[model samples]
Target: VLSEGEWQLVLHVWAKVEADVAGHGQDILIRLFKSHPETLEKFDRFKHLKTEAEMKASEDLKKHGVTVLTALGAILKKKGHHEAELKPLAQSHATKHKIPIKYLEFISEAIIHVLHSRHPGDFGADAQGAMNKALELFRKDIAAKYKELGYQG
Candidate 1:
């Protein structure tokens, strides 16, 4: 759970982030892919994008980024957390997508980067810390689901 101030930071930053959903999502996803080239293959649809320009200009990638944030956004948008809705998503990625838990951490980092760069005035160290706390809670919940499903690494 977040303090009132922490929650406000999330909402305010998220408002800025949510305004241009496609753009923010794509930026975060592309950042993740750049930091860890191995993720491209796992993400599949974006694997074909060989260049940063292609990835940035990719409609599919943009939509995929929105998809990436949609689930997390829902969870973080509430004062009372709801990991139930996200459980199936975790299951899908783990069983079908075969996405490892570590990949989620990578995504969280990219999310922070996007938030930091986009809303620096609002998302300073305090907001960044709150975002990390929020994302880590989400990450840990998914990791728990993955472990329950007999996943390793």
Candidate 2:
């Protein structure tokens, strides 16, 4: 287990990534909302949650998700690829969480379900790719930050 202070630092890094990802996700959500205002219902709960708790969860997920992406990106970047996608992070989540391999599959299904409910096939795969990329970059950035701070992950 990570020490409390270490975890706290991790949380700090997570917060920044959360803001960045939320901004990126919100961009996708906004466009989706504009094109399909009815879709707002899907994220309604996320909107009304206790602010502090929600904020913390959002950042926490982004941090772990990005860690997965970073692992994958180190491989891809080695191959000279400029981009990576959800496959790596999704796989990592399944393995690390000790859950079914379809955790992210279901999450994507849920997102698609919401989108289809509102737009009925209007939403495409735009956000998926960006989200994956954001996670990857978040990992790269955080790892660098840790190293600079003389901490080893």
- What lDDT score belongs to each candidate, Candidate 1 first? 0.82, 0.39
Please provide, for model 1 over 33-116, each residue's C-alpha lDDT reduced to its tens digit, 9 standing for 90 to 100.
Answer: 899999999865667889998987888888878886776678778643666777888889889999988988998889898888
Candidate 1 versus the native: TM-score?
0.93
lDDT of 1 at 71: 65
Cα lDDT tens digits for candidate 2, 33-125? 344434433444444433334544465434544553345335333332323543344343334433332232333334334333444222334
Instruction: For model 2, give the 10-residue run with minimal summed lDDT.
Output: 97-106
Model 2 regions more than 4 Å off: 1-91, 114-153
- For each candidate, give its TM-score against the true structure: 0.93, 0.26
Question: lDDT winner among the candidates?
Answer: 1
Model 1 segments more than 4 A misplaced: none
lDDT of 1: 0.82
